[PDB]
């Protein structure tokens, strides 16, 4: 199988639970830990679940 996984651009770890996808930068995502630490705060992100 091919699976589409989300990798955090802050820490390169898995994004499980809620994902924070940048609405400006292409193909850019933070995990909840990196989002809470304030990385990449200069752009609006979309917060939604991460199956
Ligand atoms: Zn992270
Ligand atoms: Zn961005």
Residue numbers in the entry: -3 to 47
Give passages from the manuscript.
Intriguingly, the autophagy adapter p62/SQSTM1/Sequestosome-1 was recently reported to recognize N-degrons, the N-end rule substrates of the well-characterized UPS, and where ultimately these substrates are delivered to ALS8,9. p62 is a key selective autophagy adapter that plays a role in the degradation of various cellular constituents such as misfolded proteins and their aggregates, malfunctioning organelles, and invading pathogens. Intriguingly, it was recently reported that the central ZZ-domain in p62 plays a critical role in the recognition of N-terminal arginylated BiP/GRP78 by the Arg-tRNA transferase ATE1. Here, we present the high resolution structures of the ZZ-domain of p62 in complex with 8 different N-degrons including type-1 and type-2, and subsequently identify key determinants involved in the unusual recognition.
